[PDB]
Scaffold this active site. Structure first.
Site, PDB file in Angstrom:
ATOM      1  N   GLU A  63      -7.627   0.967  -4.374  1.00 40.42           N
ATOM      2  CA  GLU A  63      -7.515   0.910  -2.913  1.00 40.42           C
ATOM      3  C   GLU A  63      -8.827   0.458  -2.373  1.00 40.42           C
ATOM      4  O   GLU A  63      -8.981  -0.512  -1.563  1.00 40.42           O
ATOM      5  CB  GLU A  63      -7.226   2.343  -2.354  1.00 40.42           C
ATOM      6  N   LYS A  67       3.523  11.189  -4.524  1.00 38.38           N
ATOM      7  CA  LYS A  67       2.246  10.721  -5.028  1.00 38.38           C
ATOM      8  C   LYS A  67       1.268  11.712  -5.596  1.00 38.38           C
ATOM      9  O   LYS A  67       0.670  11.351  -6.622  1.00 38.38           O
ATOM     10  CB  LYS A  67       1.755   9.360  -4.587  1.00 38.38           C
ATOM     11  N   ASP A 116       0.873  -1.163   0.000  1.00 36.52           N
ATOM     12  CA  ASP A 116       0.000   0.000   0.000  1.00 36.52           C
ATOM     13  C   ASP A 116       0.920   1.225   0.000  1.00 36.52           C
ATOM     14  O   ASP A 116       1.257   1.873   0.992  1.00 36.52           O
ATOM     15  CB  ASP A 116      -1.028  -0.066   1.171  1.00 36.52           C
ATOM     16  N   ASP A 157     -12.227   6.045   2.873  1.00 41.21           N
ATOM     17  CA  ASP A 157     -10.857   6.302   3.280  1.00 41.21           C
ATOM     18  C   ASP A 157     -11.018   7.778   3.735  1.00 41.21           C
ATOM     19  O   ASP A 157     -11.605   8.608   3.063  1.00 41.21           O
ATOM     20  CB  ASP A 157      -9.874   6.347   2.060  1.00 41.21           C
TER      21      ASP A 157
END
Ligand SMILES: Nc1ncnc2c1ncn2[C@@H]1O[C@H](COP(=O)(O)OP(=O)(O)O)[C@@H](O)[C@H]1O
Length: 381
Positions: free
Chosen positions: A174, A70, A9, A198
């Site tokens: 994800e 990212k 992850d 999330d």
């Protein structure tokens, strides 16, 4: 042949790796001893430190400690999303023929880096960690990119693996991983409507997932790409900056380091605020040699962010609209994202789906990793 195949992850902020050896997916612990790593790459005079030791040095190395790697990966320099953030980082992101890199100063020289290898660098350490605990060279991985990722960002985040040395099997969503963590696809032969919340360290991702017999379909995504963990810390950091300033009548604000020490203290505090009702901020010789010694209530806390905490419930509806489904139709509420440990966010959502029990048994910062590793074994040969 057999080969240990890990699922990684890669986070925006933190990244966790994990594998599943015979029966359990254990989540490879860290050198310092954490189930994470903060996704941080630093260049100083001597060495280039990835992982934790980098994040710890970001006050004493602002201009040449690269992070939030990212956020760039996938996009070209002339993109909008880069133009906005370009005004929020201690380092420099420049252009090289339409593509961007991060320019910094490594071991006295001046070099530049392409997002996929800043993000690779993390994978490399993430790579070593897997090797440390398992006792063998790890070549197979499965990586997680969010749902809004286009081929451009995938082909890059796939490329961070290749460059890291990793041979990436497949590269998955994800939210999907999370659903797989709970085995929500291991199903009971009806149709499945699942929800992923999330609430990262920087990103609020919401997804409503349809499992149509064993297989997922990615239904509707949503969220605030600039709401998250750090923002919560900022409200704390902004508060104590005031309380102290008023306790002594000496403002600290424009002190890059005095700022950070408190910062990391507010973070530490916030986390325990999820179990304990009282935090204790203890920083020695903070600023002008003065000590800071105080506390914060869980009560006081929830009210600091209350405006933001509360507001997240909004996209839940908003996806549910695009999803063309009512609150009830969801058969699973999956708490993915570290921040979902805050009980205030928890009840808000639990109340939102009216009392329904929340899928929150696995540590909301690992979860996306757990499946990453699981989906790996299947793909493992
Ligand atoms: N026990 C806790 N209570 C409250 N917040 C926490 C706790 N543990 C971690 N967090 C917060 O959650 C965020 C980490 O989420 P993260 O792991 O970045 O999600 P992702 O891996 O999807 O980016 C951090 O900002 C951290 O401060």
């Amino acid at each position: 042949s057999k080969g240990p195949a890990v699922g990684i992850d890669l986070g925006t902020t933190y990244s966790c790796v994990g594998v599943f050896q015979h029966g359990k997916v254990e989540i490879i612990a860290n050198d310092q001893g954490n189930r994470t790593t903060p996704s941080y790459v630093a260049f100083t005079d001597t060495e280039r430190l990835i992982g934790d030791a980098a994040k710890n040095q970001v006050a004493m190395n602002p201009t040449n400690t690269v992070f939030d790697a990212k956020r760039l990966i996938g996009r070209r320099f002339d993109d909008a999303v880069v133009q906005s953030d370009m005004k929020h980082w201690p380092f420099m992101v420049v252009n090289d023929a339409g593509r961007p890199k991060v320019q910094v100063e490594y071991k006295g020289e001046t070099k530049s880096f392409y997002p996929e290898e800043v993000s690779s660098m993390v994978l490399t350490k993430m790579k070593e960690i897997a090797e440390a605990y398992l006792g063998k060279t790890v070549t197979n991985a499965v990586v997680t990119v969010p749902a809004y990722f286009n081929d451009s960002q995938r082909q890059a985040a796939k490329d961070a693996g290749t460059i890291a040395g990793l041979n990436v099997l497949r590269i998955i969503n994800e939210p999907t991983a999370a659903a797989i963590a709970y085995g929500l696809d291991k199903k009971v032969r009806a149709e499945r409507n699942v929800l992923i919340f999330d609430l990262g360290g920087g990103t609020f991702d919401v997804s409503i997932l349809t499992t149509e017999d064993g297989i997922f379909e990615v239904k509707s995504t949503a969220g605030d790409t600039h709401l998250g963990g750090e923002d919560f810390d900022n409200r704390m950091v902004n508060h104590f900056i005031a309380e102290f300033k008023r306790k002594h009548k000496k403002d600290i604000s424009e002190n890059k380091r005095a700022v950070r020490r408190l910062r990391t203290a507010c973070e530490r505090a916030k986390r325990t605020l999820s179990s304990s009702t009282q935090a204790s901020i203890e920083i020695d010789s903070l600023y002008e040699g003065i000590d800071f010694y105080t506390s914060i209530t869980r009560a006081r806390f929830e009210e600091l962010n209350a405006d933001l905490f509360r507001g997240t419930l909004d996209p839940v509806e908003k996806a549910l609209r695009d999803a063309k489904l009512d609150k009830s139709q969801i058969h699973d509420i999956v708490l993915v994202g570290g921040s979902t440990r805050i009980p205030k966010i928890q009840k808000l959502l639990q109340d939102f789906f009216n009392g329904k029990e929340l899928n929150k048994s696995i540590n909301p910062d690992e979860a996306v990793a757990y499946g990453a590793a699981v989906q790996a074994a299947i793909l493992s040969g």
